[PDB]
Design a protein around this ligand. Sequence first.
Ligand SMILES: C[S@@+](CC[C@H](N)C(=O)[O-])C[C@H]1O[C@@H](n2cnc3c(N)ncnc32)[C@H](O)[C@@H]1O
Ligand SMILES: CN[C@@H]1[C@H](O)[C@H](NC)[C@@H](O)[C@@H](O[C@@H]2O[C@H](C)C[C@H](O)C2=O)[C@H]1O
Ligand code: SF4
Ligand code: SF4
Length: 300
Amino acid sequence: SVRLADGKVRNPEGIEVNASLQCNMRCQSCAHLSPLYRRENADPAEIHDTLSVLARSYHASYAKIMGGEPLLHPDVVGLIEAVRATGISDTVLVATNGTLLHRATERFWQAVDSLEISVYPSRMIAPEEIERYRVLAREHGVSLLVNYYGHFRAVYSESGTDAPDLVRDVFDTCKLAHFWNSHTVYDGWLYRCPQSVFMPRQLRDGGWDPRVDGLRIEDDPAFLERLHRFLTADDPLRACRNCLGSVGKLHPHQELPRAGWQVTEQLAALVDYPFLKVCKDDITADDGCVERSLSAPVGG
Ligand SMILES: C[S@@+](CC[C@H](N)C(=O)[O-])C[C@H]1O[C@@H](n2cnc3c(N)ncnc32)[C@H](O)[C@@H]1O
Ligand SMILES: CN[C@@H]1[C@H](O)[C@H](NC)[C@@H](O)[C@@H](O[C@@H]2O[C@H](C)C[C@H](O)C2=O)[C@H]1O
Ligand code: SF4
Ligand code: SF4
């Protein structure tokens, strides 16, 4: 999966760059807890500097420009170009809820390699508009993927678990840690997953410093094997104790517009235990969240 080659850690999936921590939706069980985050747009110069350092010892297939909703970013193309210019990835992908996609310029389509549109019931996108986006993508040689979500799985609780057996099983079947390789860059540090950096400070008792679970991005000679150890380590993070990994219980997707988004239910009551047993046998088991999907790939 994640392997060394030509003096770099290779991620066959993506390095995740959260353009905006905030969002324009309030999805229940949002894995980045974006409904709880204030306006915070990444600085392209800062992102370029950090990723240029990491790029000397790390390379991923794509850089996933995301966040909450990256189309909220005032200069998403400047961020794309900064990420591309680091050489940290072969391609640059933007993942978006689509609601703001009408605002995107031609300048945006010219700078993007791939586009992923999550389509949720509460913010449904008209097939005529998705058709137009398919035409636009083909026009600019952009790969397009449109996911129609039926469900989400719970992701965390402020009321974490004390049983190491549960934490271990949650971490062991976590697709973010082991399969999707949701490597996340934030404020100069690298994380195994978005939950480990964005959840702890949202635990209303204050949580803890997320840097306990991350790795400071540096480029001394000793960094390469440090990165190698960090990204293949097989022990649960501290954030796993409050996390449901990929085995939280399934619920019909919906927004929670009213205040009180935080989850306080006992973690163990939120675990999908039959699905955990399934993911123990096969960590790639479909999570049941996408009901229909459409892809218009551009063949390399
Ligand atoms: C955190 S979102 C951010 C990017 C963009 N705003 C979006 O939603 O597509 C990244 C991906 O994770 C998915 N996701 C977030 N929370 C999830 C959950 N609790 N269960 C299943 N998928 C989830 C979203 O559908 C999306 O494809
Ligand atoms: C079936 N749905 C999946 C699927 O499309 C994956 N395909 C490789 C993709 O990896 C998606 O994104 C991840 O979602 C996590 C919950 C948060 C993380 O930040 C992230 O990127 C998405 O959730
Ligand atoms: S659209 Fe939903 S899943 Fe995506 S960042 Fe916003 S609240 Fe989270
Ligand atoms: S905190 Fe742990 S269980 Fe949660 S997403 Fe990260 S590695 Fe997976």
